[PDB]
Symmetry: C3
C-alpha cells in the first residue's frame, strides 16, 4: 500500500492571479482525503502551509515577488522532506507552480536519486534573465537544474536553493507553448520531452513507455510527478491561469498517472494551478476541480478497468 502526506500549499505570488491560493481548499471540499481513504490509502494531513506575508518585496530586475515565492518554497521544502522522512508520498495541493522549486528540493534532500515527470503545456524553465513576464511560476525548473547553474542570478529569497536534479533526470509531457529561450535550453541541455506533437505522433501509450524506461532503465528510482492542471486541455480544466488550446485529453491525463501509479515508484506529486476564481461559470470550476481529483486518485490506485480488495467477492 502507498501512504500519502497531504501538504496544503496555498500560494499565488508566482503569478498575477490570486484565486489559486484557494486551491487546497476547493480540492479538500471536493473530498480528496475521503476519496483516497476509500482505496487502500493511508492518509495523514499535514494541514495547509500558512505562508507568511512579505510586504516589502519589490521586483528583482524584472523578477516579481521573489522573497515571498522563495520563502514559500523554502517552507514547503521542509514539510515535503518531513513527510518523506515519515515514509509517506508527499501530495502537494498547491496554488501556482513556483512551489515546485521547494517540492522537488525538499523531496531530493531525502531522495537525491529522484526522477521527475513534468506534465504541462509550458516547460517553466525560464531563468531570471530569459523570462519576459517575471512570474516565477514559469521559472521553477531553471532553479532546480544543476547544469543551469551559473545562469540564474542571486534572487533574494532563493539563496537557500541548491540545484538538485540534472537535465538528464526529467521528462516533460504535453508541451505546446514554449518560449524561444526555453526551447534553446531544452535542445542545449538535451532535455527529453514529449510535446503534444510527439503525443500525436506516437500516442499516449508509447510516450509513457518511453518516459518510464527513460527514467527507470538503469535503476528503479523514486518518481516525482509535478502535474500542472493546464497540461490538460482547457475543455477539462478551464479554471487555470495560463490555458492553451489542444491539450492532453481527460483520458490521456488518467492514462499518464495510472501508468505512473503502476510503477509503484511514485514518491512525490504536485497538483497545481487550479484557480476556482478563473471559472467562467460555476460548472467550469467544478469540471476543473473534479478532473484534478480524478487524476490524484489515479496516482494512488484508482483504475478504470476496476479495483477490488484481496478477498472472495462471490
Amino acid at each position: 500500500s502507498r501512504t500519502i502526506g497531504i501538504i496544503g500549499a496555498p500560494f499565488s505570488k508566482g503569478q498575477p492571479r490570486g484565486g489559486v491560493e484557494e486551491g487546497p481548499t476547493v480540492l479538500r471540499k471536493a473530498g480528496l482525503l475521503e476519496k483516497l481513504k476509500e482505496q487502500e490509502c493511508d492518509v495523514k494531513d499535514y494541514g495547509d502551509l500558512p505562508f507568511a506575508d512579505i510586504p516589502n518585496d519589490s521586483p528583482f530586475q524584472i523578477v516579481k515577488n521573489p522573497r515571498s515565492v522563495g520563502k514559500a518554497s523554502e517552507q514547503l521544502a521542509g514539510k515535503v522532506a518531513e513527510v518523506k522522512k515519515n515514509g509517506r508520498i508527499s501530495l502537494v495541493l498547491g496554488g501556482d507552480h513556483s512551489l515546485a522549486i521547494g517540492s522537488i528540493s525538499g523531496h531530493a534532500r531525502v531522495h537525491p536519486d529522484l526522477g521527475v515527470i513534468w506534465v504541462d503545456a509550458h516547460t517553466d524553465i525560464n531563468t531570471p534573465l530569459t523570462t519576459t513576464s517575471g512570474n516565477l511560476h514559469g521559472q521553477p525548473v531553471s532553479f532546480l537544474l544543476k547544469e543551469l547553474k551559473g545562469k540564474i542570478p542571486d534572487v533574494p529569497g532563493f539563496s537557500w536553493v541548491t540545484p538538485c536534479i540534472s537535465a538528464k533526470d526529467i521528462v516533460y509531457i504535453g508541451l505546446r507553448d514554449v518560449d524561444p529561450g526555453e526551447h534553446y535550453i531544452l535542445k542545449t541541455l538535451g532535455i527529453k520531452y514529449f510535446s503534444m506533437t510527439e503525443v500525436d505522433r506516437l500516442g499516449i501509450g508509447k510516450v509513457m513507455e518511453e518516459t518510464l524506461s527513460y527514467l527507470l532503465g538503469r535503476k528503479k528510482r523514486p518518481i516525482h510527478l509535478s502535474f500542472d492542471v493546464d497540461g490538460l486541455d482547457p475543455s477539462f480544466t478551464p479554471a487555470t491561469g495560463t490555458p492553451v488550446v489542444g491539450g492532453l485529453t481527460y483520458r490521456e491525463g488518467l492514462y499518464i498517472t495510472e501508468e505512473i501509479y503502476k510503477t509503484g515508484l511514485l514518491s512525490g506529486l504536485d497538483i497545481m494551478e487550479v484557480n476556482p476564481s478563473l471559472g467562467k461559470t460555476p460548472e467550469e470550476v467544478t469540471r476543473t476541480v473534479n478532473t484534478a481529483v480524478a487524476i490524484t486518485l489515479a496516482c494512488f490506485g484508482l483504475a478504470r478497468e476496476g479495483n477490488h480488495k484481496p478477498i472472495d467477492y462471490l
Copy 2:
C-alpha cells in the same frame, strides 16, 4: 446483403428512470428504417414488443422489478429467436440493458456458437448478491454466463433463463466504472476486456484487431454486439441514465462498428439506454439519438470512406 429484423423493445424497469421506454420511438422518428433502406438493406419491422404490466412485483431481497424485467426478457428472446429463424439480423431498439438477457438468450437458442462484443462504460456483471442498487440493467451478463451458474439466486421471473454464453465468448470495450465485485468476477472468470485504459494504450485500431481475432480466431461464428449508448462519451450521448466521463469517441464508436460490419458476421445487435427524457436540452436529445442512429447504420454498411453500388457511375 444483410437483412435486418427490427425488434422494438420499450422497457425501462431495469433501472429507475422511465424515459428509456420511448427509445424505440425516438429512434424510429429519427428515420432508422428509412436510412437502412437507402443502403443495400432488407428491413422487416417486427414492431414494438408490448410488454405487459405486473403491478405485484415487489423486490426480491434487493433485486428490483424482477418479474417485469424477467418477463420482458422472456418476451424479447422469442422474437429475437423468431427473426433469426427468419434469417435476419435482429436489431433490438431497446430501453434499458436488462433486455440483453433475453436478446443474447433468444439469439443463442438459434445460434449457440455466438460471440458477444459488449460496448459499455460498465460491465453489467453484478449478481443479485453482489449488486448494491438492485437495478437489473447492471446485472444482465451474470444471468447469461455459464460459469456464474450457482452464484445467482432464483429471481422470480427468470426461471426460464439458462446461461448460454461462457466467460470465454465475450469481450468488453469501453470500461471505466466497474464495481469491486464485478472486477473480481472479471479477473476470476478470465474475461477479456478493453477498458478505456487499454484503448488509450493500444488505440481503437489494435483493440478491434485483438477483439475480432479473440472471438473469430478458431472459427467464424455469429457476432452479437450489445451496444450501450453510455459506452460513448457523455459529449456524444448525453441523454442516458448512467453517463461516465472519458468515454469512447464518436469516431471510436463508428470505428468499432464499421469493423464489426466488415467481418460480415454480425447477427445480433442491441442499441440501448437512450433516454430522451434525460436531455438537459432539446439538442442533447438530438445529439444522443443521432449518434445512436449513426452507429446503427455503420453496423449495416455505412462507411465513412464512402459507399457505391456495383455499377459504372461514370
Copy 3:
C-alpha cells in the same frame, strides 16, 4: 527560410452561402501577415483578387455559376503562377474550394511535378455529370485530374483548364462524407486516401508517414496542400458551409501541417471555406478563424515543442 506570397481570393460562387467571400478579410484582421513575420518568414502580399461580376451566368445543365467560378479560377491561377515564379510559397486565403482548380493549375504551370495533399471531409471529385447539387466547390478535383478527362463536359468558363495532376499524385486526409459516384471514382482511379476510418485505425502519425512516402518516395517534389477548414471537426471550425461530425482534431490538424512543414517541400497552400457569417455566435467565428490561423502558422514553421533563432539565448 520559406517565403510566402499571400493571394487573397474573395470568392463564394462555388456554393450557395456568400459570407465565405469575407474570408481573406477575417484572416487578415486576425493577424496572419504579422504572425508570419514574427517567424523566419518573408511575406509579400499580392492583395485580394478583385473577382469580376458576371450577371449573365445561368446554369449549365445543373452546374451553377460556371463562368464566375471558371473566371475566378483563371484569375487566381495566374497570380499563383506569378508568386511561384517569384520563388515564393503561394498562400491562397480563399472563400470556397472551387478556387482550388485555379490554384493547383497555376501552381502546376510552374511546377508540373507537384504533389497534392487534400485535407477535407469530402473528396470534391464530382463531375458536372455526377454532381447532385451543382455547387462547383464540390467538383474541383475532377477538373484537375488527367484520367477524368473525357468525363467532364465543356463547362462555360473552364475551357482554359487543362487537367494537370494525375490520380496518382494526390492524397486525401479526413474523409467521412463522400457521394456514391465520387467513391466509384476513388476506387476506379485508384486514388490513395485516408478517411477518418484509417485515421482511427492507424493514427495521425502513421497516416502522415504513409502520405509523405507515398508522394515523396520516388523523388522530392513540391507539395500543394489544399486545406478545407471543414476537414477539422465542427467543434474547432464551426463557421463553415458544409460541416460533418467526427472530424480531425485541433491536434491532428496541427500535426498534419507541422509534418508538411518539416518536409521543407511545401510550395502551394490553400486555406478555404471559412465563412464568418455562418457562426452561431461571435466566438464560433473566433474559434474558426483562430484555428485557421494556427494551421497556417504551422505550415510555415510554428512548432508546438518550441522555436528559437540560431543564437545563444543564455
